[PDB]
Write a protein that binds this ligand. Sequence first.
Ligand SMILES: CC(=O)N1c2ccccc2NC2=C(C(=O)CC(C)(C)C2)[C@@H]1c1ccc(OCc2ccccc2)c(Cl)c1
Length: 561
Amino acid sequence: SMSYTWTGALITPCAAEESKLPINPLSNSLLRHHNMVYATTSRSASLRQKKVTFDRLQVLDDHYRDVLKEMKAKASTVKAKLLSIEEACKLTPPHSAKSKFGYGAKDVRNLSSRAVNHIRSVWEDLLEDTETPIDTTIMAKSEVFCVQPEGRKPARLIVFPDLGVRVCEKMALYDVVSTLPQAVMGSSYGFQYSPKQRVEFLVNTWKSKKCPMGFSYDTRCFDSTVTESDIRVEESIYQCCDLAPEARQAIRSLTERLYIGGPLTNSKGQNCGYRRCRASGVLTTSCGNTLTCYLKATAACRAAKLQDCTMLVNGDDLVVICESAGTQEDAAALRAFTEAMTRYSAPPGDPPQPEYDLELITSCSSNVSVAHDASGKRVYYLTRDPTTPLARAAWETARHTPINSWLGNIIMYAPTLWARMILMTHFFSILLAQEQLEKALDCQIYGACYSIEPLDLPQIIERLHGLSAFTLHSYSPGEINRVASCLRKLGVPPLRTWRHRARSVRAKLLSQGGRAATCGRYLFNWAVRTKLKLTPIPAASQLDLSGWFVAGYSGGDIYHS
Ligand SMILES: CC(=O)N1c2ccccc2NC2=C(C(=O)CC(C)(C)C2)[C@@H]1c1ccc(OCc2ccccc2)c(Cl)c1
């Protein structure tokens, strides 16, 4: 069976799509090579459609079944609650795609009599109807990138059900999908970790091995490799939770009717094809992908007889650290592993490379690098090639986009050379210039959408990274060469120029006192020679990030207000 069948109807946009970076005074001071920056559109959808459509091979074995039972054993631990319509709506992001049935996200959030009635009827139909496939829209996602060294990416696709359904998924599954991965995978579940916690875990795992070997594994179009069996097995795990009767039935109907496959419709309302694999835009895609990657990966480790495997799983991204048996025997073990995964229907994009320095391993586009704090002590932190973040920064500088990936990157990659000298300097300079310092902004962390105030960045950074994040220096030469190389490529002024801009911006922040001066002091301490003494922020210890690093939610339509 094929991941997709198509009718021949086009994947259509519903608004004019922009694709080239505008020529803007502001984004041009960040990034001069504007023709290198682009956004994907509907126009490239048929290339993706080809790429994402293939037949699937899946043969299961005892290792797989053994691991499944063990996962289910842990699942059986879990009790899960139905959300009320109220809670479910409050998790709806304000600009979520409006229902086809005469109400939108703002009406859902207000608990408008119309929206809520529609939701209740959707819910009842979920209890009453087991079999009727639920409709989904398919859309070309618009993401921005930098052009490949030699050529472009075609748009990614997003498959989502009507708003009314999305709300009913939250009611049935929000507590499950955000409690159960932890219960099952334990320390292997990556979305439980803040940035410093992920680092502690990777370094500690690495340091705990007599002789560590590690690799990342990258299955191509993970979503299209997920089969109906996979999605049903994923359901068998959810059914181990203590569930209210209505949620048990709702998950069962949602599984047959939605998760397992269904019909696709384009913005024009046209039958477009049929999906027989994971939908990218539902509440369970993050969790399901995590359980599924975990289940197969664990089974494959056993298949390859890898020793003392520790893995970290976040949706489809997967990293394994384990005991090196020797170069030859590690190389042969990885290939065995890959062929095991391939049989479970998770073949690799590129074959995994056994790796013997932690810094060389890369997952979620990020690697571990070293720097030194104030005392000179070695500090590990997560970083990445900054090209895509930077190109997106230029884009978002020239366009009011609904999500500010620049804000997210500052939060997630705060200790990096490039986030501190470029993102902060650029964006605080702009925001100062436009009186926008106190204006809250949307970004998303691990899928979930958050409204954040720029002036709160120093406390958030403290909590997510520690004080260390404000004092790192003596980055690794390879990291500096990567960042420097990247700027030449993109036409971003050199780091030397950003220090000069930072010094200026820092002054202006200190001028303003209060929360703005806090930013100047902590965020830009790197910019001045006569550094200020930096101590814990009172407001950081205090305030509240309960929902931040609990679970993955990408595609799930989640907003934490
Ligand atoms: C699709 C998605 O939501 N993620 C994602 C996955 C894969 C590639 C690139 C990404 N992009 C981003 C993620 C964010 O949250 C926000 C940010 C604007 C950054 C972009 C998130 C992510 C990024 C890194 C991740 O691990 C590494 C890591 C973790 C913590 C601190 C630093 C680094 C994990 Cl698990 C998820």
